[PDB]
Amino acid sequence: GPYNSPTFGKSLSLKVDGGFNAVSINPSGRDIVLASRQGLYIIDLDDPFTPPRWLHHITPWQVADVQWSPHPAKPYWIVSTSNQKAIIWNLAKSSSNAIEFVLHGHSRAITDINFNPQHPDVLATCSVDTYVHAWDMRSPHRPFYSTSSWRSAASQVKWNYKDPNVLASSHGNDIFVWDLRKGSTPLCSLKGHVSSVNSIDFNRFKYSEIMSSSNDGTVKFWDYSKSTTESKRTVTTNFPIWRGRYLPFGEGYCIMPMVGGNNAVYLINLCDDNKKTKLQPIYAFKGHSDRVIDFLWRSRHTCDGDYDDREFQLVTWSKDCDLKLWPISDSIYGKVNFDRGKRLEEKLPDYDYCSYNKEPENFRRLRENFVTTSGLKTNHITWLSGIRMNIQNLGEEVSAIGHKFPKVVFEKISVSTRELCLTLNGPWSEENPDDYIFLRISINFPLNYPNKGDPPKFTIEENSNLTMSKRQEILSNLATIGQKYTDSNLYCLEPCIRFVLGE
Amino acid sequence: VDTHHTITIAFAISMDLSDTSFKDLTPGESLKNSQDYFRIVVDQVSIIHWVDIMETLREEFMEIRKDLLNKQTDKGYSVANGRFSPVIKSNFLELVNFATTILTDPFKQLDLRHTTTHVMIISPGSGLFDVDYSLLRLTGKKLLSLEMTMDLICLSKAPLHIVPLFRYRDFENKLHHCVPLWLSVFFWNEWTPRCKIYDLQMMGITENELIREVDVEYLQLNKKVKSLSEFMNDYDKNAFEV
Amino acid sequence: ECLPNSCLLGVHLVISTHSGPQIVYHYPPSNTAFLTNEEEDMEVSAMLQDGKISMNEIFFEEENFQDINKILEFDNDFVAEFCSPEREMCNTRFEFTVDNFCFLGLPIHVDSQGRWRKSDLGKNMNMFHVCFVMNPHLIEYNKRIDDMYQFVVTRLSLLLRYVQSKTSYISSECHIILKEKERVLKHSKTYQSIRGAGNKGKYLYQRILAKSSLARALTECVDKIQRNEIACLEINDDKVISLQIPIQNEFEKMPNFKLQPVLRGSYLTSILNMKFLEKSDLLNYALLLLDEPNNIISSLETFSYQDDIGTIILKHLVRNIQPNIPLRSYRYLITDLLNSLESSILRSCALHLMYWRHARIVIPLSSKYTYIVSPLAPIQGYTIDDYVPLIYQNSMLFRSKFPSLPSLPIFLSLLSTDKPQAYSNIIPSREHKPVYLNALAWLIQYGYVTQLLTFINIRVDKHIKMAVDEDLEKEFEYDDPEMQHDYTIILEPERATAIEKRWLYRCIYGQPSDIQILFNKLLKYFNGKVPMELVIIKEEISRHDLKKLLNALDKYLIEIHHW
Amino acid sequence: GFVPIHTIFYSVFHPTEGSKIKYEFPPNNLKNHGINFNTFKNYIIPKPILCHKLITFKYGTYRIVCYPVTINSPIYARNFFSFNFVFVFPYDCETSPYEPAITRLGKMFKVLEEQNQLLSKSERDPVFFDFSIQDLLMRIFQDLNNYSECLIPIDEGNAVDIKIFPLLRPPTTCVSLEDVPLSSVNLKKIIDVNWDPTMMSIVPYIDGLNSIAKISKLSNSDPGLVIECIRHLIYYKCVTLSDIFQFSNIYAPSSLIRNFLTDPLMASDCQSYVTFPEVSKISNLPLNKFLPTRSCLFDLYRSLSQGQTLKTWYESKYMILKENNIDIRRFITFGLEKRIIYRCYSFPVMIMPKLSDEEEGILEESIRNAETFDKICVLLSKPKLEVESYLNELGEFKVINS
């Protein structure tokens, strides 16, 4: 289920090195995908201690956007841009070959990709070569719709939530609204922006409302049923805006800066009656020493659906290689006109909460054990250093000890299952005191570790080089150290390891 | 050099009207279904107006994609359709005959300030053109009867073959190669890549889908060999044949 | 690229004063097209006869000459303008590219107080810049510039800073260079009697090099770095500096011959200098001189000036050296000259010889070791880095060095036409043994012959597994096929599990105690990575003991043979 | 892959206050990072000798790439106009993919300033004489930092179209006639209309066992153009050279023979590769007249040795390959492709029908160049035994299996 998650009501920061430029989220709220030039990183948002699944695709050009498929019947699909082609990833497939099919459309780099909310098998791609192509995932070979602006490179493409064949694209200073049955001729051309428009977003509730954001600091709200020229509202900021989007709950919108603006995501209420105003946000998500490059939302709700009681968590990804989860308080839920608890006109969709970070797997061949697997993990011990649940964690303790002792080799680190298996060379030989014996110690932690009365369980693998009396003495001293350090409700894994080898 | 010319710049477009991929095109055969366009950008204009000439050229080149690839449907809207032909399958002899239209009559109006009629063809290819045989014969017979020098200039690197190269299919579907005498090829500019592989330079093929399918063979026999040593001897004897 | 290419085109000497920056001495005065594609006469004649002046005559030919006032299509004042940066861009890395020419240097500027170092031209000068011009390709630019700056420019500029701070040496060198330029251009009638601007510049440079010591240092540095050699430079007649760019001629894994070119004669061994230079026991190995001992003595006398204790010790070690005996046995050569201090001196001298292309490190050569012909043997190619062949040149050298031995083709065919056995099967008699070992050292030092080391991995069949299952139970079935074994290679037996360590210790079941003892001491090295030649040296065992364990354990031991 | 731009700024030479920065994205990025423009202002706007050249210099931890442009015309004040579109990168990267982009940006703006006086009129101040810069710099910065591409229209006919391409190593010149090419990709599906006709002819004959001389004779092609086409395919990292398979060859294990053990997919691919699809007839021939296990394949790969030819190795181990249905050519090819074995080349150094004059000339030239048996066999189009007999007729020779 989604309600036993440990990261939804809490704030959490993860350090994901590698230079990732794009991010997208599962609508179930379980997985988050990060795209780079080397491929995809899938992180479990309920088990952030596990290192993310790397799916390999090496490209020299920087990736633009990644997008999860919101189809409930296809929850294994990820569309990611690989320069001029979009790659659909099958997470049920193995990591060596996880690519299902590739959309070979535009000639220049794909700029943005979006899914149709009404029909989640329809995808629209925009690119630098001044083309917006609409694809069908049932027949992913040629686009069923092509349109162009013919002058300026596209920046985003977005679908209309209400009318399921209207999509808009932003090409420099101009926003063009396309009808899918009207060819390349636009329904309207919003031309009120001075500088280049970065982000575009439709309204989920109104048929004909679009918000825009540009480099001049202006956030413009449009209603193309009334007038193509001019705007219903114009909000001016002191910073350029990179991504501006409407809120998924209540009446409001969320914009974030491009190069300045204290690198904080801004949340602004939208509840009022041309109005050149300034930005008056409610909440600013302070943090993020370098600029934020995308923001997402994490939604969970009841499975059956009688009242609209859903909680939201903001997920932001920044240039300083930090992935942060932001809790949203009920003060924000009330300041935005959001009716928490309401009889549903239509029940909310239900998504499977299955993770995808784990590696999947399925003349004749004889059954054989050719080479030993044990003869065949510093990435894990460096990944666990970047996990911060905002020594206060088991994984932070494990990473600190792994950084403290480079000689100690970890064979199995599992913070989620609280099981540790580490190998070392210890001076515990009865024949010669100078001889070092290879030892395998498996450590099991309780769910109440490190509270008082809940010590870790130490099991040492049966070694021929280790005598039974010395093994029992080592185990008894390890139990003594664990009981003595859990009596003060401190952490006992560094005194134990420093006892086994050395003092 | 303080030359006083009259430039005349015209675009030259061949549009492919079929949905067949360009990889399926046979070398030597031209496109069966095509439409040919001609956008005259700058007319007979003196070269002291080179600022206006360049301005018009840049504006019309930026507008040619909207002009051609946005066809008008009778239902009241426009559909983004159409494709430019490749250089090899382009309408090169049609372009040259379009050029030689203006010299058919010796007794035309006299340009009393200018003397020579020189035609330059700017192409993004490398001197390789698939042409029709009868049109090639007619183009040669026409170019040998008038005072023009078609100076083809290629914006790609010089290839590994002799330029200009024309490939045509005869009446018996026989491939031929010929170098025309009347066309002179210039190139506008340590190892330099002189062979064009577009799908590997642009990385247009995803790494999981161009993995090698056909491998080394399975060492077929001879039906004359009864010993393994005889097989090794017959393989070593024929290891360098052909 | 593994082929050595020092991409120098020349050197500058750009100094600055309160009146403004200028240039002092630049070399060579050649054009871009060649580089890219009275008593003074008696003194210069004696210096050319004695070898004190080492210039390159091709830089002053008529087709390979540019004017002294022009450097690479730039004026002297122009170069002195853009190679004399501000105080914020001085005392740091000066990287500056003009298209394909990189102007790399470390300019030294005096501080605000007026001291060169933190501990006419003597007071006016506030900056000097020994600027090096390189033309590397764009794909190897970072590598070439980084190696040049790390190995030549920084060291030479720091030593020049020290000698200027303690002696004011560059000021005097600039003064005598400018005085000799004025005395040749405006006083000597020999200059006017010499035809051709190139020959005039050659005579002018001969006088400058005769009178100046910094000019000799810069000329030798450029000439011996462009020739890919060690540049020994004389500075202030009291200190010498040795400069080189290291050569990649050692390879553990075999490089691709027909995709990445590698110097012919490169050492395809698993024992490398760079595995030991980067660590700075080495005394378990033996040295192997890269030239004749007298040539090494002649080269090492130019590495110092006063014949100190280090040069005497190094000369004594080079004179009394043998490649068949380890360096640990050479403590007696320096105990008479004065863990342990002698072991440290031996280690430092071995690093000094093997870093400066004098004495390569090898496993000590024996007639009991199997020696194969390297794939990187210098057979093809006119020279080492070409890309009469090298086989015939080295055969002539082999015949000259050993006239009582079969030819180099005979030796290289006797070692590469049968299965590779020990080297003692080529030597006919014991009287021929030392000259054949000298031939073996010659073959290894030329890259013709490498060593075939033995690597052992441990393998377990179904019988050991069934015995271990029976022992575990202590505390199909209608047929018995003997060609359906269930085998298993324990890759690293040190980090073996509980069942796999039982497999290893059931492999030795009925063997005697010496086999039991030797298996336990050598089990951790049975991983396919440790050569058995190093195990014999380190563990103080003999070859008869090791050959017993290979014979007594035949179906369980994997034999792997590579370099 | 490609380094992000740190700061883009447009510096212009004012006729009154000299060289100055006009626009700079990000705003105040140079002063925040300690970069002082007055230290290197004489390189951004240098003398006209250094102008129209790609100037790159190091300033602290940053590498500053610029293409200074100076236009001499009497329309401007002081008879010249100078600008520079300057790019700042970190020092510890490779700015080589960005240098043609900056050079072409400077050249295109030089053309535009010489044509319609774009940058000089964009200042809106009549002191330089006798579209927004800041928006263009923002668009260039974020499009090259987010897409490695840009299409930014600046006029009705002008746009900034920049695509950053990776730099590739040049192919070697060591490719020869005796080398066989191995295509690592499916070359039939890469063929579009822009390919060279020679390469299109070569493609259906790169089967992993044809020599370059054999490919040249099969495709009716001159060997030099085949060498250049194989070089071009090497440049795109799709063809790797190998050796002609003969049973007179000598193969030995390399230092990477342990990679047959420490690899999760090498041995399984070996099992699926080296085996005949059916019970082949070679697995029924005598020596004279389930899939194979990975241990069998490893034991066969170790048993190769120097100085022992493949005929001797195969006649010593032929029941093993017959019972396990192993193709020896496929076995050797898989071993060479994974670089776990190598070939020891045979060198005929010196101390039957009448051979032709050109044939004896190329034989003598091959002998005097110490060429391998493979190259002589390719050049004479003869097997090894005929070459050996002709060499024994010509003189006495020894063979090195290096």
Please indicate whether, in this complex, the C-beta atoms of D147 and A365 are within 8 angstroms of each other.
no
Please indicate whether, in this complex, the C-beta atoms of C258 and D295 are within 8 angstroms of each other.
no
Q: How far apart are the first and last CA of chain C?
A: 23
From chain A, the residues in CB contact with C491 under 8 A are 371-372, 374-376
Which tokens hold the place of D330? Answer: 């496929």
Rounded-to-integer distance, Cα C274 and Cα C277, Å: 5
Rounded-to-integer distance, Cα D25 and Cα D10, Å: 9
Between the alpha carbon of residue C170 and those of residues A51, B191, C166, C214, D134, the distances in Å are 59, 43, 11, 7, 49
CB A455 within 8 A of CB A492: yes
- Looking at residue A349, the DSSP 8-state letter turns out to be P
Which tokens hold the place of A384? Answer: 């666990």
> At A442, is the secondary structure helix, strand, or coil?
strand
Listed as own residue / partner, the contacts of B216-219 with beta carbons closer than 8 Å and 24 or more positions apart are B216/D207, B216/D208, B216/D209, B216/D329, B216/D330, B216/D333, B217/D207, B217/D209, B217/D329, B218/D276, B218/D277, B218/D280, B218/D327, B218/D330, B219/D280, B219/D282, B219/D327, B219/D328, B219/D329, B219/D330
Exposure string of A311-337, with b = 16+ CB inside 10 Å and e = fewer, is: bbbbbbbbbebbbbbbbbeeebbebbe
- Looking at residue B211, the DSSP 8-state letter turns out to be B
A271 and chain D in contact, CB less than 8 A: no
Rounded-to-integer distance, Cα C482 and Cα C477, Å: 13
Please indicate whether, in this complex, the C-beta atoms of D147 and A130 are within 8 angstroms of each other.
no
Which tokens hold the place of A41? Answer: 């990183």
Contacts (Cβ under 8 Å, ≥6 apart) of C267? C249, C250, C251, C360, C374, C376, C447, C450
> To the nearest whole angstrom, how far is the Cα of D10 from the nearest Cα of chain B?
24
A141 and chain B in contact, CB less than 8 A: no
Please indicate whether, in this complex, the C-beta atoms of A151 and B80 are within 8 angstroms of each other.
no
From chain B, the residues in CB contact with A182 under 8 A are 77
Query: Nearest 5°: CA angle at C143, between C141 and C149?
Result: 95
- Residue B188 burial (CB count, 10 A): 9
CB D38 within 8 A of CB D24: no
Please indicate whether, in this complex, the C-beta atoms of D282 and B221 are within 8 angstroms of each other.
yes
Measured between CA atoms, the residue of chain C closest to residue D171 is C259
> To the nearest whole angstrom, how far is the Cα of B78 from the nearest Cα of chain D?
22
Please indicate whether, in this complex, the C-beta atoms of A59 and B203 are within 8 angstroms of each other.
yes
Please indicate whether, in this complex, the C-beta atoms of B70 and A99 are within 8 angstroms of each other.
no
C483 and chain A in contact, CB less than 8 A: no
Backbone angles phi and psi of B55, in degrees to 5:
-65, -45
Query: Nearest 5°: CA angle at B160, between B154 and B161?
Result: 80
Contacts (Cβ under 8 Å, ≥6 apart) of B60? B11, B39, B41, D157
Measured between CA atoms, the residue of chain D closest to residue A367 is D293
- Residue B173 burial (CB count, 10 A): 9
Please indicate whether, in this complex, the C-beta atoms of A61 and D147 are within 8 angstroms of each other.
yes
Q: Give the alpha-carbon dihedral of D384, D387, D391, D394, to 10 degrees.
A: 170
Adjacent-strand bridge partners of A354: none
CA-nearest of A290, A354, A366 to A323 is A290
C433 and chain D in contact, CB less than 8 A: no
> To the nearest whole angstrom, how far is the Cα of A415 from the nearest Cα of chain C?
23
Which tokens hold the place of A162? Answer: 């209400």
Q: Which residue among A366, A369, A423 places its CB closest to the CB of C495? A: A423
Give Dmax over CA atoms of chain A in angstroms. Answer: 92
Contacts (Cβ under 8 Å, ≥6 apart) of A25? A31, A32, A33, A68, A296, A297, A298, A315
Contacts (Cβ under 8 Å, ≥6 apart) of C36? C9, C100, C135
CB C107 within 8 A of CB C114: no
- Strands (DSSP E) contained in D134-238 are 149-153, 159-163, 180-183
Q: Which residue shows structure tokens 């480099």?
A: A215
> To the nearest whole angstrom, how far is the Cα of A60 from the nearest Cα of chain B?
9
> To the nearest whole angstrom, how far is the Cα of A443 from the nearest Cα of chain D?
28
> To the nearest whole angstrom, how far is the Cα of D194 from the nearest Cα of chain B?
6
| HSE-up (13 A, CA, CB side) for residue C282 | 23
- Residue C218 burial (CB count, 10 A): 25
Q: Which of D65, D176, D255 would you mutate first to test chain C, the one with the most C CBs within 10 A? A: D255
Residue A133, phi-psi category: left (phi > 0), alpha (psi -120 to 50), beta (remainder): beta
Q: Which residue among D172, D308, D344 places its CB closest to the CB of C258? A: D172
Rounded-to-integer distance, Cα A197 and Cα A211, Å: 11
Rounded-to-integer distance, Cα C99 and Cα D99, Å: 10
Strand C108-109 to C127-129 pairing: antiparallel
| HSE-up (13 A, CA, CB side) for residue B92 | 33
Strand A265-269 to A283-285 pairing: antiparallel
Measured between CA atoms, the residue of chain A closest to residue B70 is A184
- Looking at residue D28, the DSSP 8-state letter turns out to be T
From chain C, the residues in CB contact with D57 under 8 A are 95-97
Adjacent-strand bridge partners of C422: C370
> At A23, is the secondary structure helix, strand, or coil?
strand
| HSE-up (13 A, CA, CB side) for residue A342 | 11
- Type and span of the H or E element at C172: helix C169-185
Which tokens hold the place of A77? Answer: 């699909």
Q: Which residue shows structure tokens 């870093």?
A: C355
From chain B, the residues in CB contact with A184 under 8 A are 70, 77-80
C419 and chain D in contact, CB less than 8 A: yes
Experimentally, the structure was elucidated by cryo-EM
Which tokens hold the place of D134? Answer: 């800041």
Backbone angles phi and psi of D249, in degrees to 5:
-75, 160
CA-nearest of C137, C141, C35 to C95 is C141
Q: Which of B21, B23, B64, B66 would you mutate first to test chain A, the one with the most A CBs within 10 A? A: B66
> To the nearest whole angstrom, how far is the Cα of C499 from the nearest Cα of chain A?
10
Backbone angles phi and psi of C413, in degrees to 5:
-90, -35
Q: Which residue among B62, B202, B206 places its CB closest to the CB of A102? A: B206
From chain C, the residues in CB contact with A371 under 8 A are 488-489, 491
Backbone angles phi and psi of A17, in degrees to 5:
-80, 155
Give C398-443 as a DSSP string.
HHHH-TTS--HHHHHHHTSSS---BGGGT--SGGGHHHHHHHHHHH
> To the nearest whole angstrom, how far is the Cα of A153 from the nearest Cα of chain D?
5
Please indicate whether, in this complex, the C-beta atoms of D383 and B128 are within 8 angstroms of each other.
no
C residues 512..551 contacting A (CB < 8 A): 527
Q: Is the peptide bond before A257 cis (omega within 30 degrees of 0)?
A: no
Q: How far apart are the first and last CA of chain D?
A: 40
Separate counts of helices (H) and strands (E) for chain A: 5, 34
- Strands (DSSP E) contained in A360-445 are 388-389, 409-414, 419-426, 437-444
Please indicate whether, in this complex, the C-beta atoms of C498 and A463 are within 8 angstroms of each other.
yes
Q: Give the alpha-carbon dihedral of A56, A57, A62, A67, to 10 degrees.
A: -80
Rounded-to-integer distance, Cα D290 and Cα C470, Å: 29
Please indicate whether, in this complex, the C-beta atoms of D208 and B235 are within 8 angstroms of each other.
no
Chains near A with 3+ CB pairs less than 8 A apart are: B, C, D
C254 and chain A in contact, CB less than 8 A: no
Please indicate whether, in this complex, the C-beta atoms of A84 and B78 are within 8 angstroms of each other.
no
- Type and span of the H or E element at C447: none
Which tokens hold the place of A119? Answer: 């029909």
CB D212 within 8 A of CB D176: yes
- Exposed, middle or buried: residue A176 (CB in 10 Å: 0-12, 13-18, 19+)? buried
Strands, sheet with A154-159, edge to edge from the N-terminal-most edge strand? A154-159, A166-171, A174-179, A186-190
> To the nearest whole angstrom, how far is the Cα of A31 from the nearest Cα of chain B?
25
Resolution in A: 2.7
Adjacent-strand bridge partners of C562: C453
> To the nearest whole angstrom, how far is the Cα of A146 from the nearest Cα of chain B?
6
From chain C, the residues in CB contact with D36 under 8 A are 88
Rounded-to-integer distance, Cα A8 and Cα A313, Å: 7
CB C94 within 8 A of CB C12: no
Exposure string of A411-426, with b = 16+ CB inside 10 Å and e = fewer, is: eebebeeeebbbbbbb
Rounded-to-integer distance, Cα A129 and Cα A149, Å: 10
CB D125 within 8 A of CB D89: no
- Type and span of the H or E element at A321: none
Rounded-to-integer distance, Cα C217 and Cα C241, Å: 9
Strand B128-130 to B165-169 pairing: parallel
From chain A, the residues in CB contact with C496 under 8 A are 372, 374-375
> To the nearest whole angstrom, how far is the Cα of A93 from the nearest Cα of chain B?
13
Chains near B with 3+ CB pairs less than 8 A apart are: A, D
Please indicate whether, in this complex, the C-beta atoms of D145 and A60 are within 8 angstroms of each other.
no
Strands, sheet with B165-169, edge to edge from the N-terminal-most edge strand? B128-130, B165-169, B175-178
Please indicate whether, in this complex, the C-beta atoms of B203 and A184 are within 8 angstroms of each other.
no
Measured between CA atoms, the residue of chain D closest to residue C407 is D351
Q: Which residue among D132, D153, D265 places its CB closest to the CB of A152? A: D153
Adjacent-strand bridge partners of D205: none
From chain A, the residues in CB contact with B20 under 8 A are none
Give C69-115 as a DSSP string.
TBSSSSBHHHHHHHTS--TTSSSS-B-EEETTEEEEB--EE--SSS-
